Ligand binder design. Structure first.
Ligand code: HEC
Ligand code: HEC
Lengths: 127, 127
């Protein structure tokens, strides 16, 4: 769907920005600093589910750019494992949210965050 | 979920960028320049549905910035009518996609596009 590599870069950066907001906005809830409303969180995690599937198709071959490391494309299988593992961590978060289980939500949230960082450490260029 | 107005601006711009991609990528399909696969379009319109609900919460009071006109906030009811009308146009597009009805999809696509433009004409600052 991208006319030039720049368009893929802009898409993925936008998708990832939206994920960071839908993930990060739950930090106060998991810390207990904001109240836990199970329905609110269930709905938010459903948005996060949708969003979490979107970036990867915008790293199609030849879409070097942005802060994407070239290793994304030189070992495609490894990158795919990391995004699939991240999405399965999102599945655990969805299960927790759908169950209304705050303890499970906290644990899953932490595992999701670790999975974001694991990918960044391998595949995101440093500042 | 936004620490500063800039964060709301960045969110909404990202959301709208993603909508433009999920909407616009169907242009060749509705024109017949690319093939029509009903399942593919159904899935894409479901993503567009989700995305189409997201920008509006990021125009909360005091989030002037970006290319948002101030009139968004001075007549809140009118802006709300436009976003709600746009989302109902998206409902028509979803119905068409879910039905696998290409004629209905073309018509709905055009009405959606008109609704994007109607809002921009009133509420988006010019270049
Ligand atoms: C887990 C919930 C997250 C969160 C919160 C974020 N990511 Fe990542 N990310 C990856 C790569 C390769 C990039 C660079 C993209 C490019 O510049 O081309 C990024 C970038 C981001 C951003 C910045 C977006 C921007 O505005 O430029 C943000 C906010 C972000 N990420 C948050 C790669 C990955 C992964 C590889 C499989 C995974 C998993 C994640 N990111 C997960 C997350
Ligand atoms: C219908 C499917 C669409 C499409 C394809 C787009 N929009 Fe809009 N839009 C609105 C406002 C107020 C702005 C400015 C936001 C800001 O700068 O603070 C925009 C902006 C955009 C963009 C640019 C995003 C960016 O990267 O900066 C794009 C690509 C975009 N839009 C596409 C307002 C509205 C509406 C008011 C109710 C409606 C409806 C739409 N937009 C619909 C659409």
């Amino acid at each position: 769907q991208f006319a030039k590599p720049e368009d893929a870069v802009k898409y993925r950066q936008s998708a990832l920005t939206l994920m960071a907001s839908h993930f990060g906005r739950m930090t106060p809830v998991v810390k207990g600093q904001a109240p836990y409303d199970a329905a609110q969180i269930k709905a938010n995690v459903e948005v996060l589910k949708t969003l979490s599937a979107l970036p990867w198709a915008a790293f199609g071959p030849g879409t070097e750019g942005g802060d994407a490391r070239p290793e994304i494309w030189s070992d495609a299988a490894s990158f795919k494992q990391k995004q699939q593992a991240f999405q399965d961590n999102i599945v655990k978060l969805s299960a927790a949210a759908d169950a209304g289980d705050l303890d499970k939500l906290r644990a899953a949230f932490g595992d999701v965050g670790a999975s974001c960082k694991a990918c960044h450490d391998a595949y995101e260029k440093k500042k």
